[PDB]
């Protein structure tokens, strides 16, 4: 048991929202989960904690003097479905270095043994712009074993997806991390499903699932909760339940096969028009 996963993808593509909803589904199935927020903005746990967490590791460590004076209990909180939540934390936009904060945060979790023995899953929710080594911390040796890239039929999102695939290769070749697949978080573009499927095939992976764009997500979000909690009978709620199962039973873990910019342009022209 105990599977660690990292979620990556285009900025604002919906990874923090999808993760929390996917996790709420998992807890519904009776799975024990921890979500590790790896983004300066400590917003990867609001729908689960029903509030913006304030006890972030970095801020908590700055107060206690050093991370060495910190303690799990102070930063690790349980929310909906018994889901465990921790937030790396970081500086306000435009100052400091958020990457280093993530390195420090992850090591602290590692050394405090947060990654407990009876967890079924651990999800690292990473920001969209992996602009440095610090944000690859989740996929170093003995961390996440599977990666899921969230994207959409949008040209720029698919480019970010391929681009990230390139960055994964160094880590996948030196370790055991593998790309588990692409999660299409639909944005109503034309022939969107064909686009993602073609890119997945080119990368050598699969389109795990296709989450539809549904404003119910926004209404649930406004009330600080996932769709599974907000409205269990919602059609979208079942979409996440299906995503959860696809994840749980997934056995396809490969090493990204990055394509060139030209190959990507050629792919957009072929499956993008009409």
């Amino acid at each position: 048991a105990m599977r660690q996963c990292a979620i990556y993808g285009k900025g604002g593509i919906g990874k923090s929202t999808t993760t929390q909803n996917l996790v709420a589904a998992l807890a519904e199935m009776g799975k024990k989960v921890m979500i590790v927020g790896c983004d300066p903005k400590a917003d990867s746990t609001r729908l689960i904690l029903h509030s913006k967490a304030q006890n972030t590791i970095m801020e908590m460590a700055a107060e206690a003097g050093t991370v060495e004076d910190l303690e799990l209990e102070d930063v690790l909180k349980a929310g909906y479905g018994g889901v465990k939540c921790v937030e790396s934390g970081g500086p306000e936009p435009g100052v400091g270095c958020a990457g280093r904060g993530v390195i420090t945060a992850i090591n602290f979790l590692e050394e405090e043994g947060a990654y407990e023995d009876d967890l079924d899953f651990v999800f690292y929710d990473v920001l969209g712009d992996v602009v440095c080594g610090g944000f690859a911390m989740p996929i170093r040796e003995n961390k996440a074993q599977e990666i899921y890239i969230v994207c959409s039929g949008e040209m720029m999102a698919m480019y970010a997806a391929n681009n990230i695939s390139k960055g994964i290769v160094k880590y996948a070749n030196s370790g055991s991390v593998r790309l588990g697949g692409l999660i299409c978080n639909s944005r109503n573009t034309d022939r969107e499903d064909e686009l993602i499927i073609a890119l997945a095939n080119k990368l050598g992976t699969q389109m795990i699932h296709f989450v539809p764009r549904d404003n119910v997500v926004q209404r649930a979000e406004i009330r600080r909760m996932t769709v599974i909690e907000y409205d269990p009978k919602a059609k979208q709620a079942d979409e996440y339940r299906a995503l959860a199962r696809k994840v749980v039973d997934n056995k396809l873990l490969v090493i990204p096969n990055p394509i060139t910019m030209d190959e990507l342009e050629e792919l957009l022209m072929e499956f993008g028009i009409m």
Binding site: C97, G99, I103, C132, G134, A136, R140, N173, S174
Partner: protein
């Protein structure tokens, strides 16, 4: 001018009248310096309690620190392994500094390499530098191992050392089986000693973590010893000597005494002696592991207990009388070997020296600083001697350590006026030796500037420095000394008393003034 028969270097030379005249004109014409009255006024001010309070209120400014950064320690630790080349991933300016810092203390050659990451490597990452770097080092300096540590630059950008090394191997830059242990050594975390601790744990993990299956505790009948950051050659030697004298099988893990003391015989040896690879791989089979300086071997301890399953004894550094005794008795209990008549005699000789010199050492107030374990050892020994440590400063100390030092101080009547300061620097200590004058101060060469300042206030205010610690740059070959064991205690004791007697002779050398007390027999 110069007299070819008696040439003058800068010191005597610039005291010649023409040079004095010149410097006087330089000052008055273009330096726009503050009047001498203002300078003296401000000087006096910096010696008061009012200034001291402002001084201790500092929150952002550090002045004259008593510590170095992590990588310095990682390098020293790597030098302790056979044919190992310290490799620092990051900027080359660092390595240039680590080498010359050590060159100056040991006055020996210090081999260390860098992969010179520049502007574009800080941007795109330092993986290429690692691939070409490991290949170039191996081919050029033919080491049998490359111990990798980091500069702050590589730490900020989170360069993945493990992934770079693994890919360097996967791509043929170096053989798959070539040992390349590594450690993340943040210049902004801890101090040089933390670097030593991280580097060592990283080396122990590389040779041991994946191969614990066949290991059995106590099977090789030896005792592992981890010295920690040590810059006194005599400390490595006295430990080996005492164990061998007890007929105790031991394995010193990280032993740089040979590379730091090669003979000048017409041949340069980049590598010498050092802890072998086989010794490290076999370490888990030892009966137990002893950590000589526990306060900066915290990470190592956690690894040795969790992975090796050794019940690491709770021992203080073997300095002074009581802690050396405790060390020996523990080693005897772990190895079964009795403490020999030899060591019993050595202990008795130290006690003899203590009794012979106690009247001169009694009540003498000292200010001292250094690394955690060292400083605590000195405090403990000082107390046994009947001395009064009054200002104890450890810049890289922490709260727990301070709590332990306070307990050692409270257990003795001689610790009544002592205070322990952590996170304070030599400018703070400067204030303390003015407002609460000690007879002497014990520390590294950086304290010479403090002795300089105190004398400026007046001869009666001068606080002589007693050179013990790291680094020592203004005296020669003091790195050959010993501070551990009875031997070390004997050396420290001789130095303290004779320093005291020296100063006494200086104060009473005045003829028909103070020489009435210039006794031939002390």
């Amino acid at each position: 001018s110069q007299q070819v028969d008696k040439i003058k270097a800068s010191y005597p030379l610039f005291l010649d009248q023409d040079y004095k005249d010149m410097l006087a004109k330089k000052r008055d014409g273009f330096e726009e310096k503050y009047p001498q009255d203002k300078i003296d006024e401000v000087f006096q001010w910096t010696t008061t309690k009012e200034y001291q309070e402002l001084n201790f209120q500092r929150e952002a400014l550090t002045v004259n620190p008593a510590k170095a950064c992590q990588p310095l320690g990682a390098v020293l630790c790597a030098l302790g392994f056979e044919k190992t080349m310290p490799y620092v991933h990051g900027s080359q300016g660092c390595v240039a500094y680590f080498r010359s810092y050590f060159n100056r203390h040991f006055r020996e050659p210090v081999s260390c390499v860098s992969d010179s990451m520049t502007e574009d490597a800080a941007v795109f990452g330092g993986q290429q530098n690692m691939k070409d770097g490991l290949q170039n080092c191996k081919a050029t300096y033919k080491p049998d191992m490359i111990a990798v540590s980091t500069t702050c630059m590589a730490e900020v950008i989170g360069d993945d050392l493990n992934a770079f090394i693994n890919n360097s191997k996967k791509e043929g830059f170096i053989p798959d089986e070539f040992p390349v242990p590594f450690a993340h050594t943040p210049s902004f975390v801890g101090s040089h000693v933390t670097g030593w601790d991280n580097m060592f744990e990283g080396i122990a993990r590389y040779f041991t973590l994946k191969s614990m299956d066949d290991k059995v505790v106590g099977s090789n009948k030896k005792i592992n010893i981890v010295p920690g950051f040590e810059t006194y050659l005599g400390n490595f030697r006295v430990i080996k000597r005492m164990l061998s004298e007890m007929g105790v099988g031991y394995s010193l893990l990280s032993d740089p005494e040979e590379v730091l003391d090669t003979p000048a015989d017409g041949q340069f040896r980049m590598y010498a002696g050092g802890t072998t690879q086989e010794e490290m791989k076999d370490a888990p089979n030892a009966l137990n592991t002893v950590l000589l300086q526990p306060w900066h071997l915290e990470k190592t301890k956690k690894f040795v207990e969790g992975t090796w399953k050794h019940e690491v004894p709770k021992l203080n550094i073997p300095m002074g009388l009581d802690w050396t005794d405790e060390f020996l008795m523990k080693v005897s209990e772990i190895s079964g070997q009795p403490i020999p008549a030899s060591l019993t005699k050595e202990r008795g000789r130290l006690v003899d020296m203590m009794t012979d010199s106690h009247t001169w050492l009694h009540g003498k107030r000292f200010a001292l600083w250094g690394d955690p374990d060292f400083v605590m050892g000195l405090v403990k020994f000082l107390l046994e001697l009947g001395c009064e440590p009054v200002h104890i400063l450890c810049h890289n100390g922490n709260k727990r350590w301070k709590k332990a030092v306070d307990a050692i101080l409270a257990a003795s009547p001689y610790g009544k006026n002592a205070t322990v300061y952590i996170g304070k620097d030599l400018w703070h200590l400067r204030s303390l030796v003015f407002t609460d004058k000690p007879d002497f101060m014990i520390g590294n060469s950086y304290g010479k500037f403090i002795q300089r300042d105190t004398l400026h206030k007046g001869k009666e205010f001068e606080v002589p420095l007693i050179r013990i610690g790291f680094p020592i740059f203004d005296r020669h070959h003091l790195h050959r000394s010993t501070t551990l064991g009875y031997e070390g205690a004997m050396q420290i004791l001789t130095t303290l008393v004779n320093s005291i007697l020296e100063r006494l002779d200086e104060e009473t050398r005045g003829m028909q003034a103070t020489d009435y007390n210039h006794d031939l027999v002390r």
